[PDB]
Amino acid sequence: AMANNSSVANKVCLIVIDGWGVSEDPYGNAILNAQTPVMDKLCSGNWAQIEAHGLHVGLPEGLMGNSEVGHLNIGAGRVIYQDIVRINLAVKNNKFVTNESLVDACDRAKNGNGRLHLAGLVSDGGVHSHIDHMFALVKAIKELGVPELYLHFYGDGRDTSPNSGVGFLEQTLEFLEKTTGYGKLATVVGRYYAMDRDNRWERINVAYEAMIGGVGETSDEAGVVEVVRKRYAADETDEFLKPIILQGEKGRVQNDDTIIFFDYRADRMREISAAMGMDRYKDCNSKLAHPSNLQVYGMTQYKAEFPFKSLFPPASNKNVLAEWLAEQKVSQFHCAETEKYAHVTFFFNGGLEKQFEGEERCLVPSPKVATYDLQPEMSAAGVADKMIEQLEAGTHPFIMCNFAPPDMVGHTGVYEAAVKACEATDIAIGRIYEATQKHGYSLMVTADHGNAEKMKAPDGGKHTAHTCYRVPLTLSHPGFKFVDPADRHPALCDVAPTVLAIMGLPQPAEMTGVSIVQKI
Ligand SMILES: [Cl-]
Ligand SMILES: [Mn+2]
Ligand SMILES: [Zn+2]
């Protein structure tokens, strides 16, 4: 227990069912075709249906929710964005030209020798980068008035076809000369050399020396596409392109220059960026001098030790529900089956290992079976047991668990076992609800995303995937009325704030709201 447990106005039991969504279509809907009388009552009258997919939880529009994103958003009380989502939103709404770090890189150039470098993987593979981000950056840097911009094109062939690079090179060349009339291609080199992540500095050195010294084949805008096509016929593909050099010494990285790397994945950026921006050029052991007074910038942060500013730096995830309750000196309980323990732990608590002060944990072991359709109740009963024991104790004014059956059985695709899963989950919830009533907890049932509600493809085939359907949010306490946000659908990010409002605890500013209940 914790010193301010008595300040709590209403103790709360939160259940996160895993893979339990709301769908009107009953064909292959294991929740609808399962005896679920407990949830059928809890999901009626005062109850809400909230989003767990797509942008509502920091994912690309249209993408199904999943267990990690779900538990992250639930426990965080804010939307937890993917980096790629953050970047693409910024492209949609012209927020590059106001980006503080990008404005910083550009101002430094403008008040120095004004030379800027763009370097990254040029393709639409979308794993490490996107060429549209590169395009969007050139336009931005143009608007901001940087005098000179040179581009260092890293060839892909791994997240795209090995002979796709000519197309992106053509498309880059036309963009710079006809669309922006600004920016110049200075280098082409394969990601094999520039985006090594196994500390093979002899590979990095190839891209290093090309950028700073022009160690490659000379070409120009008129010839460069032919060079690459000749390389293809020599059996050298995008990934493995040896360097090509386009603007002479003007396009090299020189003294006092600024560099922006536009990849948003870090592992394959740490080496080239540390070679340019710290002391790792020494590992390349080049006979070339290292330029003086460089400053590097990254689309994202590649290593917190690095001094590099970032266009989209990491969110700290400060004052997620678990940390915040401990700050208020209120104690808590987290419980789950094996298969979902990282969800009520690592991910609920912000995506780290921290178990905060006053946080008590319980791991109920999952059954040892080959597939979970062979025991579709899994260990939900045991999880309920431990939760009911905490309700009898009354020690923790906030307790929570996860029930795995609906998701983990849904993934098998066996429709009738899914039905059993949801039946066994519903019985478990019913046991806790009885206990909350007897020991005066308010019960709240939600889910992290759907799954069980769609078990069949239109044609009857197995459908094992997660869904984009909304999920329930129930509240047994009759002095509150559910109310939607005025500006958006409610979403997982509103579970934690709503919890704190029922508990009479303040909300921390990092929790970008919002309680979706109001008192009667
Ligand atoms: Cl080589
Ligand atoms: Mn799953
Ligand atoms: Zn899940």
Residue numbers in the entry: 20 to 539
Please share excerpts from the published article on this structure.
Phosphoglycerate mutases (PGMs) catalyse the interconversion of 2- and 3-phosphoglycerate (2-PG; 3-PG) in the glycolytic and gluconeogenic pathways. The enzymes have no amino-acid sequence similarity and differ in their mechanism of catalysis. iPGM is comprised of ∼510 amino acids and facilitates the intramolecular transfer of the phosphoryl group on the monophosphoglycerates through a phosphoserine intermediate and is the sole PGM in nematode. The iPGMs are monomeric bi-domain enzymes where a phosphatase domain, structurally related to the alkaline phosphatase family of binuclear metalloenzymes, is connected by two hinge peptides to a phosphotransferase domain8. The glycolytic phosphoglycerate mutase, iPGM is an attractive target for the development of broad spectrum antiparasitic and antibacterial agents owing to its essential metabolic function and evolutionary divergence from the human enzyme.
Although soaking of pre-formed iPGM crystals with Ce-2 caused the crystals to shatter, we succeeded in obtaining two apo crystal forms, monoclinic P (iPGM-m) and orthorhombic P (iPGM-o) lattices of native C. elegans iPGM. These crystals provided the structure of a nematode iPGM. As anticipated from primary amino-acid sequence homology among iPGM orthologues, C. elegans iPGM is quite similar to other iPGMs of bacterial origin. Similar to other iPGMs, Mn2+ occupies one of the two phosphatase domain metal ion binding sites while, as in alkaline phosphatase, a Zn2+ ion was found in the second binding site of C. elegans iPGM. The identity of these transition metal ions was verified from phased anomalous difference maps calculated from data collected at wavelengths of 1.0000 and 1.9016 Å. These metal ions contact the histidine and aspartate triads as shown in Supplementary Fig. 12 at coordination distances listed in Supplementary Table 6, and the catalytic Ser86 nucleophile coordinates to the Zn2+ ion. From the apo iPGM structure we observed that the N-terminal 18 amino acids, unique to C. elegans iPGM, were disordered.
